[PDB]
Paper text:
S1 binds to angiotensin-converting enzyme 2 (ACE2) on the host cell membrane via its receptor-binding domain (RBD), causing conformational changes that trigger a secondary cleavage needed for the S2-mediated membrane fusion at the plasma membrane or in the endosome.
Indeed, BLI assays showed no competition between SR31 and MR17, indicating that RBD could bind both sybodies simultaneously. This structure was similar to the individual MR17- and SR31-RBD complexes, with an overall Cα RMSD of 0.67 and 0.38 Å, respectively. Aligning the biparatopic sybody-RBD complex with the MR17-RBD structure revealed no appreciable changes at the MR17-binding surface, reinforcing the idea that SR31-binding does not allosterically change the RBM surface and that SR31 is highly likely to be compatible with RBM-binding antibodies. Indeed, the biparatopic fusion MR17-SR31 displayed a remarkable increase in binding affinity compared to SR31 or MR17 alone. Its KD of 0.3 nM was lower than MR17 (KD = 83.7 nM) by 230 folds and lower than SR31 (KD = 5.6 nM) by 17 folds. Consistently, MR17-SR31 neutralized SARS-CoV-2 pseudovirus 13 times more effectively (in molarity) than MR17 alone. By contrast, the biparatopic SR31-fusion constructs could only act on one RBM, leaving two free RBMs that could bind the dimeric ACE2 much more efficiently compared to S proteins with one accessible RBM.
Residue numbers in the entry:
A (entry chain B): 334 to 526, 532 to 539
B (entry chain A): 1 to 109, 113 to 120, 999 to 1115
The structure:
């Protein structure tokens, strides 16, 4: 019944941002063996909450949303941003309360010749609402011609491959992103009743 | 590095056929939508046909429907335009294009002629140094993004190649402290809420205390700073 924070940050594979993953962390105790430091993350920003709320889940569920984007797109994982990622892929509310963690993953998510396994949505009829997830693959109609059969040059498959190559500049390297949001509970979790003594006897 | 090379053009009588080749180097042809355009005399460029990534489909301008076929050989990294039943209105320079959407980061996007007849969360340690055995030091940990009062704070140390070793901790919203047996009596952990800072007072230092010392807050996972070097000489 340890909180699987280690699984979130050390996961072998991450989701594409258009199909971003959500993991629920609940009714568990903090894992006193898991540690990250300044060198681990390139960003660790909280909005309207102190990250110490992650330590006690007695009245809290934590939701960890994770995915891979470009270094120069991490700035879009913030309240009130625009751009392809915030508009069409993963949108934080204007009143967002939670934390955003990101780190350079060039050493895991790039490879010689390019890694193309990660995708993002390039076209959409309207902007996502906060925390909306759109994994559809309907053909996108960019012109006046409808899209039927193979008709229509201006008809577009809406998902786009990143191409992460290891020698790209840092702004075009892949970054893993974890968004942490907090659910206030009304009844105490069963876990409620994992102590600093575990490290000191 | 990244190159698209068009070929296949020529001068043919109305009703004949051609096959254009777009040979690509520096990326796999199948990962992005690939496209054929043409610019006819006296007109602007026109999209002719496109083949989406993988098996997501093909597209054709109505003017070439039933006459042109676009295809892709992954092994040869080439996109083809098979043109049958050519008409004079197909006369044009034909061009290849990759829809990388800027993912070929350093590739800025010749043709073939066809003629038909809010706060950052961070901890920063300081106070380390080189001292004589028996001496003292005081490490400071300046915290940003959270109140030190609200967290369990701790110090650990790590000698290179060795295993990290917890040294001291202080309880969240409280005053209970904990110490490794190895440092009891010599080390004292304390918290200044006004300065959002935690300290490690180290007395009677031993050469065995040599290590990088880190401060850390418990936020589900431990989150620690950058470390400060403590070296004790006998
Ligand atoms: C689980 O993840 C942990 C955290 O990884 C970091 O954070 C994530 C978010 C991501 O950003 C990663 O890129 C980060 O590494 C892992 O712990 C970290 O492991 C790395 C090594 O893989 C450690 O690093 C070294 O740090 C040393 C300082 O103490 C440096 O000496 C060293 O530098 C090398 O390279 C430079 C040149 O650039 C040379 O000058 C140096 O001389 C040296 O050759 C590395 O930078 C990092 O310190 C670890 N961080 C923490 C907080 O522990 C963890 O990895 C496991 O645990 C560690 C202790 C090792 O035993 C690993 O081998 C082991 O796998 C991950 N766990 C698993 C199972 O993968």
């Amino acid at each position: 019944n340890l909180c699987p924070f280690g699984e979130v940050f050390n996961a072998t594979r991450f989701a594409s941002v258009y199909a971003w993953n959500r993991k629920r962390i609940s009714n568990c105790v903090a894992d006193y063996s898991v540690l990250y430091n300044s060198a681990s993350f390139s960003t660790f920003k909280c909005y309207g909450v102190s990250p110490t709320k992650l330590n006690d889940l007695c009245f809290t569920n934590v939701y960890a949303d994770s995915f891979v984007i470009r270094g120069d797109e991490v700035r879009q994982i913030a309240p009130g941003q625009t751009g392809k990622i915030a508009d069409y892929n993963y949108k934080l509310p204007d009143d967002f309360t939670g934390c955003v963690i990101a780190w350079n993953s060039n050493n895991l998510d790039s490879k010689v010749g390019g890694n193309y396994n990660y995708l993002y949505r390039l076209f959409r009829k309207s902007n996502l609402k906060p925390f909306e997830r759109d994994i559809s693959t309907e053909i996108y109609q960019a012109g006046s011609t409808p899209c039927n059969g193979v008709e229509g040059f201006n008809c577009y498959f809406p998902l786009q491959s990143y191409g992460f190559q290891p020698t790209n500049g840092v702004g075009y390297q892949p970054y893993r992103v974890v968004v942490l949001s907090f659910e206030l509970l009304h009844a105490p979790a069963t876990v409620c009743g994992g102590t600093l003594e575990v490290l000191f006897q | 590095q990244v190159q698209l090379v068009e070929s296949g053009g020529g001068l043919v009588q109305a009703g004949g056929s051609l096959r254009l080749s777009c040979a690509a180097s520096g990326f796999p042809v199948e990962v992005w939508r690939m496209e054929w355009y043409r610019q006819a005399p006296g007109k602007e460029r026109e999209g002719v046909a496109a083949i989406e990534s993988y098996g997501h489909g093909t597209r054709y301008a109505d003017s070439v429907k039933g006459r042109f076929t676009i295809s892709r050989d992954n092994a040869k990294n080439t996109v083809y335009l098979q043109m049958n039943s050519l008409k004079p209105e197909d006369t044009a320079v034909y061009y290849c294009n990759v829809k990388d959407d800027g993912q070929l980061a350093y590739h800025y996007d010749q043709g073939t002629q066809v003629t038909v007849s809010s706060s950052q969360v961070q901890l920063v340690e300081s106070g380390g140094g080189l001292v004589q055995a028996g001496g003292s030091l005081r490490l400071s940990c300046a915290a940003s993004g959270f109140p030190v009062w609200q967290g369990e704070m701790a110090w650990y140390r790590q000698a290179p190649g060795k295993e990290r070793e917890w040294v001291a901790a202080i309880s969240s919203m409280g005053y209970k402290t904990y110490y490794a047996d190895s440092v009891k009596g010599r080390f004292t952990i304390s918290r200044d809420n006004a300065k959002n800072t935690v300290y490690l007072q180290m007395n009677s230092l031993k050469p065995e205390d040599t290590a990088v010392y880190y401060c850390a807050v418990m936020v589900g996972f431990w989150y620690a700073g950058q470390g400060t070097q403590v070296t004790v000489s006998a």
